[PDB]
């Protein structure tokens, strides 16, 4: 019906404005991230997402500066950005982004409501893609800081996963303090719960671990309306943290904790959970932040071996998405892991 034409800067490459026309605008949702629309680009007919937030007079928008640097198949691409005007006499930043039709949150909930779990092949695909996205953003020192099922977008037919919502993302520089109130209930690393301000990108990995555990269990692994309640659930699984583990999380807490013995992880999940899935969780969800796998090491984990098989297909018969086209940037934290990550068939001439 109605067509909106704006002049917008491309997300990447040279700043040469373009005339972007779109129609059929619908709200996807709104909240602390602003408003996210869906729209159809008039030329191509392609669906896109437009995230609109209020632009501060005093500062450049952080999320924009992050989004302009990122180019990866498992992160929603910033296509265009422009400024416009709900609150009158005020400016809004608009981000025109890839649109993806589903979220891991919605998918997980469909299966949970049906009293089933997602097939493992999809857990593998989705989590592998999440870890790639993290290996990449971390290679810039950028921490997402809000990894949770709703921020993981999924295409139901191609099995492509894209990380979205960089409104909490930040470059973490060693020795700089960062706020500890980021990251969503259920997915917060223990050092965040303990109020640490010197945390690293490893908080993203904890969160990714909670996502994995949740897709395997059918419900969140560390629920609780308070930090206290989340710690209790964490302690029931990991066991009581030692003093050395406490100091690694947050020095100013070296309170007394309930003395609980570790619950053997095989006991945590349903009987036929693949053991390599369980081993992977156990290496993500560690108290000591530096003891956790890096994202790139998680990608190289045996849980993901099936994805490296030359004859692996999606259940609907299609090919898997691209999983091995690693760039030097992506590999830069440990280049020899290429020897596992790029399987032999992916290196045929």
């Amino acid at each position: 019906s109605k067509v909106t034409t704006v002049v917008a800067t491309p997300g990447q490459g040279p700043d040469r404005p373009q005339e972007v026309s779109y129609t059929d605008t619908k709200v996807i949702g709104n909240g602390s991230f602003g408003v996210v629309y869906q729209a159809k680009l008039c030329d191509s007919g392609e669906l896109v997402a437009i995230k609109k937030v209020l632009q501060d007079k005093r500062f450049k928008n952080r999320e924009l500066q992050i989004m302009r640097k990122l180019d990866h198949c498992n992160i929603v691409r910033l296509r265009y950005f422009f400024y416009s005007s709900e609150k009158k006499d005020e400016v809004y930043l608009n981000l025109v982004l890839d649109y993806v039709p589903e979220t891991v949150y919605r998918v997980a909930r469909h299966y949970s409501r049906a009293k089933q779990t997602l097939p493992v092949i999809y857990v593998k695909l989705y989590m592998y893609q999440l870890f790639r996205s993290l290996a990449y953003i971390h290679s810039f020192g950028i921490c997402h800081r809000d990894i949770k099922p709703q921020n993981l977008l999924l295409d139901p037919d191609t099995a492509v996963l894209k990380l979205c919502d960089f409104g909490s993302a930040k470059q973490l520089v060693r020795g700089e303090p960062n706020v500890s109130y980021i990251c969503s209930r259920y997915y917060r690393a223990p050092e965040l719960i303990f109020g640490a301000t010197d945390y690293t990108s490893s908080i993203d990995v904890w969160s990714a671990g909670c996502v994995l555990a949740e897709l395997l269990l059918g419900q969140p692994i560390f629920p609780g309306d308070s930090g206290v309640d989340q710690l209790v659930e964490i302690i029931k699984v990991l066991g009581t943290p030692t003093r050395e583990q406490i100091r690694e999380m947050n020095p100013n807490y070296t309170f007394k904790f309930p003395q609980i013995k570790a619950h053997p992880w095989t006991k945590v999940f349903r009987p036929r959970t693949p053991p390599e899935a369980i081993a992977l969780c156990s290496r993500l969800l560690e108290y000591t932040p530096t003891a956790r796998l890096t994202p790139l090491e998680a990608c190289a984990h045996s849980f993901f071996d099936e994805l490296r098989d030359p004859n692996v297909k999606l259940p609907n018969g299609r090919d898997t998405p691209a999983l091995f086209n690693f760039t030097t940037q992506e590999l830069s934290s440990n280049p020899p892991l290429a020897t596992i990550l790029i399987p032999p068939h992916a290196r045929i001439q």
Partner: peptide, 8 residues
């Protein structure tokens, strides 16, 4: 970067 204009 921006500047808006609507049509139909």
């Amino acid at each position: 970067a921006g500047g808006a204009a609507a049509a139909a």
